Amino acid sequence: SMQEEDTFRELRIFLRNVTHRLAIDKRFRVFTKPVDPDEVPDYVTVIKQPMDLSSVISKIDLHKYLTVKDYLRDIDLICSNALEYNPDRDPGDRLIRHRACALRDTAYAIIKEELDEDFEQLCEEIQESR
Ligand SMILES: Cc1cc2ccnc(N[C@@H]3CCNC[C@H]3OCC3CCCCC3)c2[nH]c1=O
């Protein structure tokens, strides 16, 4: 119905706003775009489902997220990919792991403060009837 389409449009507006606020944070610049295969050749072989904030924005616009839970699975993916690909004790690896965890904690914190729980429940109940 039109009311269900209104609900998903509001969701999309909310998710774009959250993603924009992550994307403009200097700490998270490394997660804003896909990894360049020329700079990092083995990334594509090691990381089976790459994810980045530009991809997330594309998925919002393609209507791929019908709940905030689905959205947070891709934010979690951005984080777990970074922890998987950069596991070493070296400062570079430790810096990106720290930023990846900050990205994840920041996304969850914005959602905790600004997502109405009854709005998320509505989205879930529409998706389960789809
Ligand atoms: C998403 C992503 C990008 C990336 C770019 C370059 N290098 C990476 N990994 C390196 C592996 C070897 N140890 C050093 C690592 O680079 C740490 C840098 C990454 C850019 C931000 C400052 C620290 C990359 N790994 C990735 O997961």
UniProtKB/Swiss-Prot annotation:
Induction context: Up-regulated in breast, uterus, colon, ovary, and stomach tumors. Induced in breast cancer cells overexpressing NCOA3 or treated with estrogen. Down-regulated in 5-fluorouracil-resistant derivatives of the colon cancer cell line HCT 116.
Tissue: Highly expressed in estrogen receptor positive breast tumors and in osteosarcoma tumors.
Transmembrane segments: none
Subcellular location: Nucleus
Coiled-coil zones: 108-130
Bromo domain ranges (all copies): 3-114
Family the entry assigns: Belongs to the AAA ATPase family.
Quaternary context: Interacts with ESR1 and NCOA3 and these interactions are enhanced by estradiol. Interacts with acetylated lysine residues on histone H1.4, H2A, H2B and H3 (in vitro).
Function field: May be a transcriptional coactivator of the nuclear receptor ESR1 required to induce the expression of a subset of estradiol target genes, such as CCND1, MYC and E2F1. May play a role in the recruitment or occupancy of CREBBP at some ESR1 target gene promoters. May be required for histone hyperacetylation. Involved in the estrogen-induced cell proliferation and cell cycle progression of breast cancer cells.
UniProt name for this protein: ATPase family AAA domain-containing protein 2
Gene transcribed to yield this protein: ATAD2
